[PDB]
Amino acid sequence: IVGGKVCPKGECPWQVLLLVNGAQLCGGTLINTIWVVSAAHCFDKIKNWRNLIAVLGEHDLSEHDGDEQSRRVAQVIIPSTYVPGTTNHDIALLRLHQPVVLTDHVVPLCLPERTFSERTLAFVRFSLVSGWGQLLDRGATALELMVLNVPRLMTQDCLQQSRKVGDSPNITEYMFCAGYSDGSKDSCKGDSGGPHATHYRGTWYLTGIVSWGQGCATVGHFGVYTRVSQYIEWLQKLMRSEPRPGVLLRAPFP
Amino acid sequence: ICVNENGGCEQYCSDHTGTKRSCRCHEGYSLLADGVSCTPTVEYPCGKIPILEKR
Ligand SMILES: *C[C@@](*)(O)[C@H](CCCNC(=N)N)NC(=O)CNC(=O)[C@H](CCC(=O)O)NS(=O)(=O)c1cccc2c(N(C)C)cccc12
Ligand SMILES: [Ca+2]
């Protein structure tokens, strides 16, 4: 997270930390006691699927305070339309081998219904993005969970307001821009899979997943997030299915 | 009517034939008698921050 602040311990209780062989990989969002929503591109280079760990209740990476809860990731489900190396359909649904115990520091973010998310949440200007990702472009990652408030834009307004480069991934219907173009605030590498949380009448909902962007907080550019509303039905359908042998599972989308 | 201001619903809204609307709530919540508000039915409902709720 660039240009944000430390999320006070316990105020980002749905934030998930993904580890591979003990090393920081990405973030994720808890949506119930056994399901985590993250980003598909976080698993492009994984070869040892049995060493993938999810940590809930995490805050400070240099200290164990007893609120942390670790779980092995039993399954990583990715939409069939996702192509490794690219950014479209950048979402992954993770099943934990064992449920986490809800506590003051471990709480799920509400996965909204599609209608509600499209005709209500999508219009809430500001939302929170978080993670232990890089504090700066080409900079070090954070020891404490960071959070940043960012404004959402219409893809249209994002397009003709961003410095057109080249070979830059297209902004599709499965994405949306959020952030600032003055090079001050944005999510960054390492924050991927993390939640873009939106508040509405006293409750928070999952509307985005940290996905990509040209550099971090690059002047003239915004951060791009996976448009979760497009995957609500896909997610609900998978959470109702029995687990299958093998960690990685590509599932049909729609 | 759900399209306009979430049909007055605190959480989810479903349209019905005519001018009939039904508000619903996420798991871990119950719809109040006003037919729009949702109240937690568990200790840790989704989207709520405990240390803040208890403040
Ligand atoms: C999964 C993640 O942790 C990470 C999160 C980044 C969020 N960024 C912002 N909020 N600004 N996601 C990725 O790493 C996905 N890829 C990119 O963001 C990529 C940067 C590559 C890198 O430096 O490691 N940018 S991009 O997808 O916009 C991209 C893609 C392809 C080519 C790019 C170029 N070429 C022309 C050199 C330039 C700029 C961006 C490019
Ligand atoms: Ca810790």
Find the farthest-apart pair of alpha carbons in chain B and give their distance in angstroms, rounded. Answer: 43
Residue B51 CA to residue B5 CA, distance in Å, equals 30
Give the CATH fold of the A13-108+230-243 domain: Thrombin, subunit H (2.40.10)
The domain defined by A1-12+109-229 carries CATH number 3.30.420.40:
no
Report residues whose beta carbon is within 6 angstroms of any ligand 1 atom: A 26, 39, 41-42, 87, 167-169, 186-192, 210, 212-214, 216, 223
Point out the ligand 1 atom lying closest to the alpha carbon of residue A186.
10
Of A230, A120, A228, residue with least CA distance to B11: A120
Nearest CA to ligand 1 atom 1: A192
> Which residue intervals of chain A bear CATH 2.40.10.10?
1-12+109-229, 13-108+230-243
* The CATH homologous superfamily of the domain defined by B1-55: Laminin (2.10.25.10)
CA B24 / ligand 1 centre spacing (Å)? 39
- Domain residue limits, chain B: 1-55
Residue A247 CA to residue A105 CA, distance in Å, equals 27
Tokens of A181: 């173009």
Q: Which residues of B fall within a CB distance of 8 Å from A106?
A: 44
- Burial class (CB within 10 angstroms; exposed 0-12, middle 13-18, buried 19+) of A146: buried
Query: Any alpha helices (H) in chain A, and if so which ranges?
Result: 114-119, 155-159, 232-239
Nearest-by-Cβ selection for A10 from B12, B47, B51: B51
What is the stated resolution of the deposited model, in angstroms? 2.3
Kindly report whether the peptide bond that precedes residue A169 is cis, defined as omega within 30 degrees of 0.
no
Q: Cα separations (Å) of A229 from A34, A114, A117, A119? A: 20, 5, 6, 10
Determined by: X-ray
Contacting residues for A215 by C-beta, under 8 A, at least 6 apart: A137, A221
Q: Which residues of B fall within a CB distance of 8 Å from A33?
A: none
Residue A179 CA to residue A37 CA, distance in Å, equals 21
Nearest-by-Cβ selection for A205 from B2, B13, B47: B47
